[PDB]
C-alpha cells in the first residue's frame, strides 16, 4: 500500500488477488529526498501555500507546525493524501468539519497548539534532559499529585451515589450519570477547564460542597513539584487537552456522543469507580513523553481502552486518498487489545516522532513498515484469541476428565483383583496342582558319530541365570487325568490317519499359561508409591477447584458399577506363552524377548516363572480364578550384549571376516540369533564392508525375525486392532 | 505438433505480460477440437413454439440477426427501432463500415418517428466507435482502405459529435494504416484539448486481431483477461500522463504485434520530434525491445530519440546500453554502408545538460556522466571501460 | 461430514452384540442374548448345563436372568458403537467449533441463522405447536 499510493504505480498494471509490487525508487537506500515521489508532492504545495522552501521531510512537517491557520487550511485544501498505508486511524479535524466549522476550528486549534509547541521546546525539553538517565521519572513525579486529585473525584462520585450500590440503579440512571461525564469531557476540550461547572448541581448546599472540591482540585492543579518547573495543570493543558482538541469531531458530534455513553456504561458495570480512577493515573504515570511529536503517550491500559473506545474503535474514521475521500462505516475493534494496537501505531506515526526515521526516504519506509508490521501481529493475535483460548480450555477440560475417570476406575480394579485371588484359593485346594516348576538349560540335538540316537541322556537340571535373548526349557508336572490318558496313547504308537487325529484333539483338551514375573525392590516400591500419591493429591486439587468434576467422579463410579462384569513382592513383566499344549515330554522351549508386549526394554533383578494350568472340560470359558498355579525358583535376568561384545572385541564397526564367528560366539553363550537377523545385517555395510553394530542390535531387539510364543499364534489383523480391543476390554474391566 | 513462433521481439517479463496479451497462442489451436460440437450445435434454428413464446427483445434480435441486411434496415426504418443498429452491424452480408454509417444515417432520415433533429440524427458514440474500429481492423488487413476512412471521418466529424471516443478510434485508424505522424499529432491534439484516450480503443489497439463486433458479441471467451489488463493499464497511464503518451504506447505495442518494426521505431522517432512526453513504461519497453533486437532495425535519429527519452526519464544502465550498442553497431562490418549516428551541437548540449541536471541529485548519473559524454561525443577510449570494470570488480 | 455420520448411524443399526448373565442367587442360570442396533433381540437362549439341581427356580428368577442378559448385551452394543463412532465425532467438534467462519452460520451470517431461529419459533407460537 505504500508503493501503490505514489506516481510510479501508473506504469504498472497488477493482479488484484496477489499483486507483486514493483521496486520503488525509495526501495533503494541511495535515494535522496529530492528523488522521493511523495515528498515532491509535499514540497510543491509547501512553496505554494505555506510559502517555504523545503528540502527534507524533517523540514516539511516542522514547517507544517510553524504555519498560520490561514495557511494551514490553504495547504490542506489542496492536499489529498491523508493516509499512505490505508490503515484506519484517528485523524485531525481538517478531514472533518465541512464548511465554516473548518475555519473556526483552525483559528482555535493552531493558536492553542502553538502554545503547546512553545511548552515543549524549553519547559519540557530540559526536564527530560535532567532525567535522561533512567526513563519514566518525570511522570512518576506527577503520579502522587494526581492521586490526591482523584480522591476528590471519588468523594464527589460517592456523594452522588447517596449510599446505594451502582449495580442496583435503574438503567436510565446509569445513562443519566454517563451523559453528564461525556459532556464534562466536552467542556474540558473546548473551554480548557479541568473541572468545569455544569448546570446539573442547582442545590446551594451542593454548590458549596462542589466549590470546596473545585478549589481543592485547582490548589492541587497549581501546586508545583520541586524537581519539575511545570505545574500539573499545564501538563494536562498542553499534552492531554491539545491532543483531544485535534480530534474535536469526536466530542462535538452527537452520534459519537451516544457511543461514549454506551462505552462508559460497560466500563462502569464491570469495574468500580475506585478502580477506574487509579488506572487513569497509572496511564499517565506509566507512559512516554515525546518531544519531537509533542504528545504524551499513555499506557493504553484496559480501562483506558474502554474510555477512548469511540475514538479508536468506532466508525468515526474518515480516510482521504487521491482515489477517494471515503467515510469508513462499520469499523469495529473486536477486543481491547485492538485499541492498544491502533493507538500504538497512531502515536508512533505522529509527525516528527522518534519511531520514524527521517534521514533517507528508504529509512523512512523501513521505519514505517515495521510500525505496521508490529501492528499486524497484534491484530493477528486478536483474531486468533477467542477461538484458540476456548480450544485450550476445552483441551484442558478433557485431560482433567480423563484423570478423574481413571481415578474412579482403580478401586474397581482392586476389588476385582482381590476377589479373583480369593476364589483361586478355594479352587486350588480342591483341584490338581502343578508341583515341579523348574527352569532347565536347552540341550543340543546335534550329536557325534559315536553317540546313540535312542538314549537321550541329558535334559538339564537347573538355571540360575537367564539372559534376555536366550531360550530356556521349563519343566512342568501336571497330574490332570487327560495328561495320563495321552501318555498311554502316544506311547502305544506304523501310523494311521485316524490315530493321529486322536492325538491332536487330546492336546487341545487343556493347556498351560506360562508367564514371567519380576520382583519389586523395596526402594523401587517407595519410588512407585511416591508417584501414585503424587497423582492422588493432584487429582483431589483438581476436584475441589472445579465442582463439575466432583459430579463426574460420582458418574464414573455409578457407570462402572453397571458396565463391569461382576465376579462371584512380585510384579508381572512378560507373558511368555498363551497356549502351551499338553505334551508327553512335559517340556517346552520358551524364548524371552528383549521387549515386552507393551514395548519397552526389560530391567534387571529377580525373576520367577509363573505357570498357570487350564482345562477346557472342567473349566469352560476360561475363568482366571480357576487355574492350577505353580511358582519357579528365582533367577537373574539381564542383558549380555554389553558383556559379550566387550569380551569379543576387547566399538562402532564390525569387520567382514569377524562377523561370522561373532554370531557363533553369541550362540555359544546361549543367545539365539536367527538366520534372518544374520542375513539382513549383511545388507547394510560401509565402503570397507563393515557391518554396523547399532543396525545389528536394532534388528536383534526388534520383533521382526523372532517373537514371543504368545504373539506367535496371532494374526496381523488381530495385532493391528490389539490396542483398540484392549481399550474396549478396559472399559468393561476398569482398573 | 511443433509450430513456429512469430518474431514480435517483445520482452519476456512479468511486468509486460499485459503487453504479451494479443499474441496468438497455439494453446487455443490445441483447444480448438473441443469446441467443435458446440459450434456444430449452434447452427440450428429453434422450434416454432419456443420462438413464438420468446420475449420481445430476444425475438427481435434473433430474427433481425438472421434476416438479410437491407430487409433488417427496412424493418428498423419502418418501426423506428434504432436500438437494433448493433444487430445489423453483424449481418451476414453487411458492407464495409462507411456504407453502414451512410445506411444508418439514411435510416434515421426516412424513419417513421422523427425526433427533433439535434437528437434524431445523433448516433451513439458506441456505434461510431464500433464502426471506426471495424474500419481500423480493415486498415490493418488492407492499408489502402484508409483514404476512404479519411472521407468517412470527413463526414462523421461534420455530422456526428466529435467525442474523445471517436477521436481515439480515428487515432487507431491512422495507426493501423501505417500513418505514424498524423496519428501522434491527433493524439497530441486530444491531449491539448484535455480529452481522455478511450480505454477500449487502447485495449483493441494492442489486440491486432479480434474485430470488435464479435468482441462485443463475445464469441471469443478467452483473452478477456488481457482486455481487462489493457483497459486497467490505460486507466493507470492516464492517471499520471496525458492522452498522447497512452496513444504512443498503444502504437508501439500495435506495431510490435503486427511485425511492423520500422513503424514501431518511427513511433518513437515521431514522438521525440513532435514533443510528446513518453511514459516511463513505454521508454522501458522500447529499451527492452532494442535489447531484444540488438539494435539491428534502428536508425541514427531513432537512436537520438531513445537517448533523449532516456536522459529525460530513464536509468543510467539503459542509456549506457543504448549508446554502447549504437557505437558497436556503427563499428560492425554489416552497417558500414549505413551512415553513423552523429549528434548536432544543440541537441548534444541539451542531452548533456539534462544528464548534468539528473546527476546533481543522482549519484548513479554522476558516476557515469563522463562515460555518457564520451559516448555522445564519439571519442570513446577503452581505458574508461577498463576503469569501469576495475571499479565494478573492486 | 453429514454423510459420514449417516454412514456410521446406519452401520451400527444393523450390527450385532452379545452379552451374558449368571444368576447371583445360587442358581446356575446362564442366559446369552444377541441384540441389534435397534434395541431388539435376535436370539434369547438359556443354559441349564451349569445347574443340575432344578425345580427350585421360579419364573421370576428366570426373568431376572434374562433382564440381566439383555442389559449386558445392550450395554455391549452401546460401548462398541462408542468406539466405532467415537474418534469421528471427536474430530467433528474440532472442525465445527474452530471452523465457524467456514460454515453458513458463523461470522456475518450468524445473525441470519439466529433470525431464522426466532422466526421459526413465532410460526410455531402462532399455532398451538408451542404454546399449546
Amino acid at each position: 500500500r505504500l508503493r501503490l499510493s505514489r506516481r510510479t504505480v501508473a506504469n504498472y498494471v497488477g493482479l488484484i488477488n496477489s499483486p507483486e509490487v514493483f521496486d520503488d525508487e525509495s526501495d533503494r537506500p541511495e535515494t535522496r529526498w529530492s528523488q522521493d515521489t511523495f515528498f515532491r508532492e509535499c514540497a510543491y504545495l509547501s512553496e505554494k501555500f505555506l510559502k517555504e522552501k523545503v528540502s527534507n521531510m524533517q523540514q516539511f512537517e516542522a514547517a507544517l507546525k510553524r504555519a498560520s491557520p490561514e495557511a494551514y487550511l490553504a495547504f490542506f485544501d489542496a492536499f489529498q493524501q491523508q493516509t499512505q498505508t490505508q490503515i484506519p486511524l484517528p485523524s485531525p479535524s481538517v478531514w472533518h468539519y465541512e464548511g465554516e466549522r473548518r475555519k473556526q476550528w483552525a483559528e482555535k486549534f493552531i493558536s492553542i497548539s502553538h502554545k503547546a509547541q512553545a511548552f515543549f521546546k524549553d519547559v519540557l525539553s530540559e526536564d527530560v534532559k535532567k532525567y535522561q538517565e533512567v526513563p519514566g521519572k518525570l511522570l512518576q513525579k506527577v503520579k502522587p499529585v494526581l492521586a490526591d486529585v482523584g480522591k476528590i473525584l471519588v468523594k464527589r462520585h460517592e456523594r452522588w451515589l447517596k449510599g446505594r450500590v451502582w449495580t442496583s440503579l435503574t438503567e436510565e440512571e446509569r445513562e443519566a450519570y454517563c451523559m453528564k461525564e461525556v459532556k464534562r469531557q466536552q467542556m474540558q476540550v473546548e473551554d480548557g477547564e479541568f473541572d468545569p461547572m455544569m448546570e446539573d448541581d442547582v442545590d446551594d448546599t451542593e454548590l458549596e460542597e462542589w466549590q470546596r472540591e473545585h478549589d481543592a482540585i485547582m490548589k492541587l492543579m497549581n501546586s508545583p513539584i520541586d524537581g519539575l518547573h511545570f505545574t500539573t495543570l499545564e501538563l494536562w493543558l498542553h499534552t492531554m487537552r491539545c491532543e483531544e482538541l485535534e480530534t474535536e469531531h469526536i466530542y462535538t458530534s452527537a452520534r459519537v456522543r451516544a457511543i461514549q455513553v454506551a462505552a462508559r456504561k460497560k466500563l462502569y458495570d464491570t469495574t468500580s469507580y475506585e478502580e477506574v480512577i487509579q488506572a487513569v493515573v497509572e496511564s499517565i504515570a506509566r507512559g512516554t513523553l515525546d518531544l519531537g511529536a509533542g504528545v504524551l503517550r499513555p499506557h493504553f491500559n484496559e480501562v483506558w481502552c474502554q474510555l477512548n473506545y469511540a475514538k479508536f474503535g468506532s466508525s468515526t474514521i474518515t480516510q482521504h486518498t487521491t482515489t477517494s475521500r471515503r467515510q469508513l462505516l462499520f469499523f469495529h475493534a473486536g477486543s481491547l487489545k485492538d485499541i492498544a494496537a491502533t493507538a500504538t501505531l497512531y502515536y508512533a506515526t505522529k509527525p516528527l516522532s522518534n519511531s520514524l526515521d527521517y534521514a533517507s526516504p528508504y529509512k523512512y519506509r523501513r521505519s514505517l513498515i515495521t510500525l505496521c508490521s508490529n501492528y499486524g501481529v497484534e491484530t493477528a493475535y486478536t483474531t486468533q484469541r477467542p477461538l484458540l483460548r476456548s480450544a485450550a480450555n476445552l483441551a484442558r477440560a478433557e485431560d482433567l476428565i480423563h484423570a478423574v475417570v481413571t481415578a474412579a476406575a482403580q478401586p474397581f480394579g482392586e476389588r476385582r483383583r482381590a476377589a479373583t485371588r480369593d476364589l483361586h484359593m478355594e479352587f486350588q485346594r480342591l483341584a490338581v496342582p502343578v508341583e515341579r516348576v523348574i527352569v532347565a538349560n536347552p540341550v543340543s540335538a546335534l550329536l557325534e558319530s559315536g553317540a546313540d540316537p535312542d538314549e537321550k541322556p541329558v535334559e538339564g537340571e537347573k538355571v540360575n541365570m537367564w539372559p534376555l535373548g536366550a531360550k530356556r526349557v521349563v519343566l512342568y508336572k501336571w497330574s490332570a487325568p487327560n495328561v495320563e490318558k495321552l501318555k498311554a496313547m502316544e506311547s502305544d504308537a506304523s501310523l494311521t490317519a485316524k490315530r493321529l487325529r486322536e492325538i491332536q484333539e487330546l492336546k487341545r483338551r487343556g493347556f498351560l499359561e506360562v508367564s514371567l514375573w519380576r520382583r519389586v525392590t523395596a526402594q523401587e516400591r517407595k519410588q512407585r508409591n511416591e508417584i501414585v500419591e503424587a497423582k492422588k493429591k493432584q487429582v483431589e486439587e483438581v476436584v475441589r477447584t472445579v465442582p463439575s468434576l466432583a459430579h463426574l467422579h460420582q458418574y464414573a463410579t455409578s457407570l462402572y458399577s453397571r458396565i463391569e462384569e461382576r465376579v462371584a513382592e512380585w510384579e508381572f513383566a512378560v507373558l511368555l506363552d498363551d497356549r502351551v499344549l499338553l505334551n508327553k515330554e512335559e517340556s517346552v522351549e520358551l524364548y524371552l524377548p528383549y521387549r515386552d508386549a507393551n514395548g519397552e526394554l526389560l530391567a534387571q533383578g529377580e525373576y520367577r516363572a509363573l505357570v498357570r494350568a487350564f482345562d477346557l472340560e472342567a473349566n469352560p470359558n476360561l475363568h482366571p480364578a480357576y487355574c492350577s498355579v505353580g511358582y519357579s525358583e528365582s533367577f537373574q535376568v539381564f542383558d549380555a550384549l554389553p558383556q559379550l561384545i566387550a569380551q569379543f572385541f576387547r566399538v562402532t564397526h564390525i569387520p567382514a571376516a569377524d562377523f561370522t564367528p561373532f554370531c557363533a560366539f553369541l550362540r555359544d553363550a546361549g543367545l539365539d540369533v536367527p538366520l534372518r537377523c544374520e542375513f539382513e545385517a549383511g545388507q547394510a555395510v560401509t565402503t570397507d564392508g563393515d557391518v554396523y553394530m547399532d543396525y545389528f542390535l536394532q534388528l536383534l531387539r526388534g520383533e521382526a525375525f523372532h517373537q514371543s510364543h504368545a504373539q506367535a499364534g496371532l494374526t496381523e489383523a488381530q495385532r493391528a486392532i490389539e490396542p483398540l480391543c484392549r481399550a474396549h476390554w478396559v472399559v468393561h474391566h476398569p482398573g | 505438433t511443433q509450430l513456429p513462433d512469430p518474431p514480435y521481439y517483445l520482452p519476456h517479463s512479468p511486468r509486460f505480460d499485459a503487453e504479451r496479451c494479443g499474441t496468438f497462442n497455439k494453446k487455443w489451436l490445441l483447444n480448438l477440437p473441443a469446441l467443435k460440437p458446440l459450434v456444430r450445435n449452434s447452427t440450428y434454428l429453434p422450434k416454432k413454439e419456443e420462438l413464438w413464446r420468446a420475449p420481445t427483445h430476444e425475438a427481435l434480435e434473433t430474427i433481425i440477426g438472421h434476416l438479410p441486411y437491407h430487409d433488417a434496415l427496412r424493418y428498423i426504418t419502418e418501426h423506428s427501432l434504432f436500438l437494433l443498429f448493433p444487430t445489423v452491424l453483424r449481418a451476414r452480408d453487411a458492407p464495409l463500415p462507411h456504407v453502414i454509417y451512410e445506411d444508418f444515417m439514411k435510416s434515421c432520415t426516412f424513419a417513421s418517428l422523427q425526433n427533433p433533429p439535434e437528437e434524431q440524427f445523433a448516433l451513439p458514440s458506441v456505434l461510431l466507435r464500433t464502426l471506426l474500429c471495424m474500419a481500423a481492423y480493415h486498415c490493418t488487413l488492407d492499408a489502402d482502405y484508409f483514404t476512404t476512412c479519411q472521407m468517412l471521418f470527413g463526414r462523421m466529424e461534420q455530422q456526428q459529435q466529435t467525442t474523445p471516443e471517436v477521436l481515439s478510434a480515428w487515432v487507431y485508424c491512422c495507426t493501423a494504416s501505417g500513418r505514424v505522424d498524423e496519428a501522434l499529432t491527433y493524439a497530441k491534439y486530444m491531449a491539448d484539448c484535455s480529452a481522455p484516450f478511450d480505454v477500449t480503443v487502447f485495449s483493441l489497439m494492442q489486440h491486432p486481431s479480434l474485430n470488435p463486433i464479435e468482441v462485443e458479441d463475445g464469441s471469443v471467451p478467452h483473452s478477456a483477461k488481457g482486455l481487462l489488463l489493457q483497459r486497467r493499464l490505460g486507466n493507470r497511464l492516464h492517471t499520471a500522463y496525458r492522452s498522447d503518451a497512452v496513444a504512443a504506447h498503444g502504437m508501439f505495442v500495435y506495431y510490435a504485434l503486427t511485425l511492423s518494426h520500422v513503424r514501431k521505431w518511427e513511433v518513437i522517432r515521431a514522438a521525440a520530434a513532435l514533443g510528446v512526453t513518453l511514459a516511463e513504461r513505454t521508454v522501458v519497453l522500447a529499451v527492452e525491445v532494442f535489447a531484444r533486437e540488438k539494435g539491428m532495425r534502428c536508425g541514427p535519429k531513432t537512436v537520438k530519440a531513445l537517448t533523449h527519452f532516456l536522459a529525460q526519464d530513464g536509468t543510467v544502465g539503459h542509456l549506457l546500453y543504448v549508446l554502447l550498442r549504437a557505437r558497436k553497431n556503427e563499428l560492425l562490418p554489416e552497417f558500414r554502408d549505413l551512415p553513423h549516428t552523429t549528434f548536432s551541437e544543440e541537441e548534444q548540449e541539451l542531452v548533456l545538460q539534462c544528464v548534468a541536471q539528473r546527476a546533481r541529485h543522482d549519484d548513479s548519473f554522476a558516476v557515469a556522466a563522463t562515460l555518457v559524454s564520451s559516448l555522445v561525443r564519439e571519442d570513446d577510449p577503452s581505458e574508461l571501460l577498463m576503469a569501469f570494470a576495475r571499479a565494478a570488480r573492486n | 461430514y453429514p454423510a459420514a455420520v449417516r454412514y456410521g448411524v446406519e452401520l451400527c443399526t444393523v450390527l450385532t452384540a452379545e452379552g451374558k448373565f449368571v444368576d447371583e442367587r445360587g442358581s446356575g442360570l446362564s442366559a446369552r442374548c444377541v441384540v441389534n442396533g435397534t434395541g431388539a433381540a435376535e436370539s434369547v437362549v438359556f443354559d441349564t448345563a451349569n445347574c443340575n439341581g432344578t425345580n427350585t427356580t421360579s419364573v421370576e428368577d428366570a426373568l431376572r436372568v434374562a433382564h440381566g442378559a439383555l442389559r449386558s448385551a445392550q450395554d455391549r452394543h452401546n460401548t462398541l458403537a462408542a468406539f466405532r463412532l467415537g474418534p469421528l465425532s471427536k474430530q467433528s467438534q474440532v472442525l465445527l467449533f474452530c471452523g465457524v467462519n467456514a460454515y453458513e452460520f458463523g461470522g456475518k451470517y450468524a445473525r441470519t441463522y439466529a433470525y431464522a431461529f426466532e422466526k421459526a419459533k413465532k410460526e410455531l407460537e402462532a399455532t398451538a405447536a408451542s404454546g399449546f
Binding site: 515532491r40 469495529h332 473486536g334 | 541529485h361 | -
Partner: peptide, 28 residues
C-alpha cells in the same frame, strides 16, 4: 467484526482496480 474486515477489503480493491488522479509536482 466481519463488516470491518470486508470494508477494508473493499477500499483496498478500489485502490487496486481504479487509480485516482495524481496531484501536481514541479519537474527539474
Amino acid at each position: 467484526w466481519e463488516l470491518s474486515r470486508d470494508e477494508q477489503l473493499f477500499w483496498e480493491r478500489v485502490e487496486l482496480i481504479r487509480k485516482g488522479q495524481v496531484a501536481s509536482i514541479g519537474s527539474s
